[PDB]
RNA sequence: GGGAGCUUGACUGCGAGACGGACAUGUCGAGCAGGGACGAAAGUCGGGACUAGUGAUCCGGCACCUCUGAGUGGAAGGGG
RNA sequence: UCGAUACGGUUUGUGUAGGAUAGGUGGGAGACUGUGAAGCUCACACGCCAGUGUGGGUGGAGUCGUUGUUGAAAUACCACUCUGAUCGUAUUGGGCCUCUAACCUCGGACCGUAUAUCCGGUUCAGGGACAGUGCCUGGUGGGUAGUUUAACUGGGGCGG
RNA sequence: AAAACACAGGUCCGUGCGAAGUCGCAAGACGAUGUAUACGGACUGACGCCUGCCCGGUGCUGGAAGGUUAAGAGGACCCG
RNA sequence: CGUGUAUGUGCGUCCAUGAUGAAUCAGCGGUACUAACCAUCCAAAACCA
RNA sequence: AGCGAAAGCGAGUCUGAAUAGGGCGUAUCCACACAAGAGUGUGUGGUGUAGUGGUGUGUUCUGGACCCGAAGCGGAGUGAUCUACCCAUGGCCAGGGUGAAGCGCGGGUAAGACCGCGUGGAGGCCCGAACCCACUUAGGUUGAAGACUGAGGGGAUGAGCUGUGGGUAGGGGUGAAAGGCCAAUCAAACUCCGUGAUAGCUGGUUCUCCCCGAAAUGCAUUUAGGUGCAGCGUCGCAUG
RNA sequence: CGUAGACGGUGAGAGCCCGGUACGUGAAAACCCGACGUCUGUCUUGAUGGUGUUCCCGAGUAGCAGCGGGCCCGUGGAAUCUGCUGUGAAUCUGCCGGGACCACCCGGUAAGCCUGAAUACUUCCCAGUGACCGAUAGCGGAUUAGUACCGUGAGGGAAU
RNA sequence: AGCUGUCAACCGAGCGUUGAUCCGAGGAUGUCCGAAUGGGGAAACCCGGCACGAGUGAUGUCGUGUCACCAGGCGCUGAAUAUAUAGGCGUCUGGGGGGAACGCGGGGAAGUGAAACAUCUCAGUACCCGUAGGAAGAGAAAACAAAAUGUGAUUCCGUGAGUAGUGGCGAGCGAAAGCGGAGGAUGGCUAAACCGUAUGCAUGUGAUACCGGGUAGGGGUUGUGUGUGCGGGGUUGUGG
């Protein structure tokens, strides 16, 4: 199995190194944990992007979580979408968690991971202000207001 | 335990052959392994019966 | 039957004509050629005075041969 | 923790003519020294205790070459290598101890679930690359199955 | 219809727990909602007095210093 | 066991009679952030033989 | 067109060193030479070669193969309304005896052990109907009955008997064990199917006349009551 | 009489007595086969050279190995095809077949899919035929026949 | 122009030239059981929910619809638990069972033969399982062939041939090429390279980008990796 590392693992190599491991090692450990990606046409670029993104998005302590909360709740954001005629308000699909994260960043906010965004619970199907809860930590939830606007 | 849930791989039937050439019916079972497979990155696992061939080919995934 | 000299016919290619007889087996054979032994020569020698000491076919082994060789040259395998 | 090979290096060669424990071979008339030699006092390895390589201190200006020998020369220096002793870089197998992440738990809790000692999921607590299960392989195997176990004969059996 | 079986009582062997055993291709079930004072198998057969000698043979239990031994590894050398 | 109508007694949602109990301000002691008080144990650095 | 294992050669070919001798082949006959009386052969000439496709009959091959008959062997189903054992839930056991433990009282003792007398009502306890068995005997034996009847016999509060409902299925069940029992059938049930199973064995195989007419021996045989070949019959052709 | 002398029936062998027969004729509706339209697609720039260590040409696949299956082929010198279990390639100088295998030639272009006709059969419906049966025959069943009856059941199963 | 099916008449009543009986086609009605499907059940008999209507003084009662399970679309919700998912609601569309033979794909005997028997045979037969269709399967060369200037998808029939061979070389088993016919479609469509577009997942705020030159302007992130879908392009062996 041929892998490109996205983190430093001891006795294997450094982030970005191409390594050949036993199938059991990669399939049951490195790949589940996201320490490596399968070697592929774009894998060198993807592995560097993954590691740099992780270091920016990671949250460490409940103190950092409360700092993120108090920063994030001080904002109101704009999400841009492609939508039906105004009377329906129906969007031509659905806001993704990646849209919410990139909108929060584009509006001068933290770089959060997308799995923290409780988007399904927001039930955003039309256009207008919609509150979305972001779970920074088990005890730290921030509420953010998104405008959804036709592009 | 002789049928793969992904590709449908079943057992083959044939003969065991004695030194004296006595032919007795036997099966060739697929090597299917219990795997706790996932469906999306970082999701709930579901126990399935996958053949070793599907595991080797990456048709089942883990977390 | 007893003794002595030399020797390898305890041969290769063959075999007119017979014995025996359910069949398969078995048995005798003069004589022709090759290349030899002994003998001065005539000649005798295809094991042992004679009749037991043995086992069909299949399958397979080994040596040799101017046979065959699955498109062709080889080879494997198969023939003699 | 062993074991095969490879690659970086080092140890180590008693025909006799002999300055003498003659490596076969090529570049071979000059090296080795003050980034400190001849000559000794010790530590270490082998041992045919003949004597070799080596570290430190001391010493301070050599041993040297066709030198004649010798099939074969210089322990003046440089190259791959071989009788064999070894160390680290790889490659690759055997055993052993661990780790967690595959896999396992008829161990706990919680959820699907109003109902539920089924089942599945989540999680905690334990096993753990073992076990279980494919494929391949050697054993044990009247537990079971298909069958065989002659004829002659003053009936058959026994004897022959 | 018994002198046979069963029997209470005895001894041995197995079983540390979805045990051993059994039914089933498995899942699962019985064993048992039991836990070695229990459960299964074997022989003996209330009770009384007793139950000697042999471990060469064949089983069972444990051991592994030797002899032998599969597939898997290896792959010299040889042949087309 | 059910169903409908009628009649008569008390019981009541709103009216109201009886019934309880909790937040919070303010006056007080022992938990006790924290600098200390008291009792006790040990020797880094260590002096001497 | 044959010969040869074949390459291949061809009225020849194979074996072989042979122009040796044999093997197989050149339809069959006739004449004439030339060699042989070792069985006659070798050359010339002539004469010429008979097959194949329908269809009758006899035998034979593969099929049920002239017809009838096993015990048994598979595949798939059906059965625990009989019987064996088990599970759940009900019922039944006249009458009469015996007198365990425990308890109480009185002897006895320092207290006991122990010993009388009551009370008590134990037990795969006793006698004996129902009920459940089937020990002996007589009868029945083309029965009244495919297992019974009469007379006696055993158990009869228990490892009891019994109703209802249920469960275990064939190499399987169940069995206080007789290979017992599993629907009058059990050393492997029943039914349908493979299937017209297979029998070197037994039985059977139907109108007529005319001619001929055996064998019961030899050899071999997982053979001895089977079969092959020979011997002996018959029909046809040839030779007389 | 006959384009009718098929076959039945009718009081006994009927072309001319009857139902018919030869030959003609006929469908409101439904169904089936066409044709023709609508309607639906699709196309409308093609021929022609050059050029190249450029890219592509069906991957857990081919190949290989173990154990099997199946092929005339019973493991055999055993190709070709194929299941399971391991191992695991090349994109045209590629790869796979030409009965082990190798070389050289020849054929073909695997691991994507669809495809009418020639072939097999008849529960059922229509029209016919027989050197087929004629009531112990022919279907088990010309008669209430899978009935009566037998068996717990599967199933067996008449007679007139 | 006669009828009221028949065994099957007898009685008792009626229809039909205003066209009956009868024959053909299309509709209506079609209790209960049965896949059986509201729930249950010893098939054909027991008990219901909901909606609408009828009937009661009201209860009871009576019509007519509808209510199983599973699979797959579409919508809502998203447990333990955060992302979510399992699941839960709602709704639409299907499937289920039967049928004599014929097809395809799987599983797969034994009697028997070998005069015993195990290899082998019987036989891939009997039976069984999964699925069809009016036929099915197969089919458009990773084919044969043998140096012929060969044939050219598949299937089926006749030959080749009881041959080559195979076989306890026993009993037995047994091709293919080639050639003669039936049929006509030597038939079609796709995957990749490379363009375009949509959109998932990473990035980026600067180059890039906006069909391509030569440019002249402009616009400013429209960008840049990689995956997937839908259109162009590409359907081939002399290689394309
Ligand atoms: Mg692996
Ligand atoms: Mg098979
Ligand atoms: Mg067999
Ligand atoms: Mg003499
Ligand atoms: Mg000799
Ligand atoms: Mg002779
Ligand atoms: Mg003799
Ligand atoms: Mg001579
Ligand atoms: Mg002689
Ligand atoms: Mg002599
Ligand atoms: Mg033999
Ligand atoms: Mg050849
Ligand atoms: Mg060849
Ligand atoms: Mg040879
Ligand atoms: Mg030979
Ligand atoms: Mg293991
Ligand atoms: Mg036996
Ligand atoms: Mg048999
Ligand atoms: Mg005898
Ligand atoms: Mg005798
Ligand atoms: Mg004897
Ligand atoms: Mg008796
Ligand atoms: Mg006991
Ligand atoms: Mg167990
Ligand atoms: Mg014992
Ligand atoms: Mg006893
Ligand atoms: Mg032992
Ligand atoms: Mg038998
Ligand atoms: Mg039977
Ligand atoms: Mg039953
Ligand atoms: Mg008693
Ligand atoms: Mg009895
Ligand atoms: Mg009598
Ligand atoms: Mg009596
Ligand atoms: Mg009495
Ligand atoms: Mg008595
Ligand atoms: Mg009594
Ligand atoms: Mg009692
Ligand atoms: Mg019952
Ligand atoms: Mg007995
Ligand atoms: Mg009986
Ligand atoms: Mg039997
Ligand atoms: Mg048969
Ligand atoms: Mg018979
Ligand atoms: Mg006579
Ligand atoms: Mg005879
Ligand atoms: Mg007539
Ligand atoms: Mg291709
Ligand atoms: Mg085979
Ligand atoms: Mg090949
Ligand atoms: Mg097809
Ligand atoms: Mg008659
Ligand atoms: Mg009849
Ligand atoms: Mg019966
Ligand atoms: Mg009946
Ligand atoms: Mg129902
Ligand atoms: Mg039901
Ligand atoms: Mg959630
Ligand atoms: Mg169906
Ligand atoms: Mg036999
Ligand atoms: Mg026989
Ligand atoms: Mg088709
Ligand atoms: Mg042959
Ligand atoms: Mg495309
Ligand atoms: Mg070509
Ligand atoms: Zn699989």
Stated as kind and residue range, the H or E segment containing B17 is strand B12-17
Q: How many CB pairs under 8 A join A and B?
A: 8
What are the structure tokens assigned to B15, written together? 């003969």
**Distance CA B21 to C1' G125 in A:** 72
How close is the nearest chain A Cα to the Cα of B52, in Å? Answer: 12
What's A8's domain CATH number?
3.40.5.10
Is A140 inside a domain boundary? yes
Domain boundary among A58, A78, A100: A58
Is A151 inside a domain boundary? no
CA distances from A6 to A1, A34, A113, B26 (A): 16, 8, 17, 49
Is A69 inside a domain boundary? yes
Domain that holds residue A100: 63-144
Domain boundary among A17, A33, A58: A58
Domain boundaries, chain B: 1-62
- What is the experimental method? cryo-EM
Count of structural domains within chain A: 2
Q: Hey, CA dihedral for A76, A80, A86, A91, is it positive or negative?
A: negative
Nearest-CA neighbor of A28 among B37, B7, B33? B37
Domain boundary among A11, A33, A58: A58
């Amino acid at each position: 199995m041929k892998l490109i590392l996205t983190a430093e693992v001891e006795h294997l190599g450094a982030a970005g190194d191409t390594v050949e491991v036993k199938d059991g090692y990669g399939r049951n450990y490195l790949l589940p944990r996201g320490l490596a990606i399968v070697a592929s046409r774009g894998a060198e670029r993807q592995a560097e992007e993954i590691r740099r993104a992780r270091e920016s998005k990671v949250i460490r302590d409940i103190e950092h979580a409360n700092e993120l909360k108090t920063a994030l709740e001080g904002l109101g954001d704009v999400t841009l979408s492609v939508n039906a005629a105004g009377d329906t308000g129906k969007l031509f699909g659905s806001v993704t968690a990646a849209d919410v994260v990139n909108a929060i960043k584009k509006a001068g906010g933290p770089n959060l991971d997308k799995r923290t965004v409780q988007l399904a619970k927001a039930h955003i199907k039309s256009v207008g202000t919609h509150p979305v809860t972001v779970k920074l930590h088990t005890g730290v939830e921030a509420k953010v207001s998104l405008n959804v606007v036709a592009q | 335990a002789a049928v793969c849930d992904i590709c449908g791989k079943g057992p083959g039937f044939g003969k065991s052959v004695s030194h004296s050439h006595r032919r007795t019916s036997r099966r060739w079972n697929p090597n299917i392994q219990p795997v706790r497979a996932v469906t999306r990155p970082g999701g709930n696992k579901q126990r399935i019966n996958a053949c070793t061939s599907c595991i080797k080919a990456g048709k089942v995934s883990r977390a």
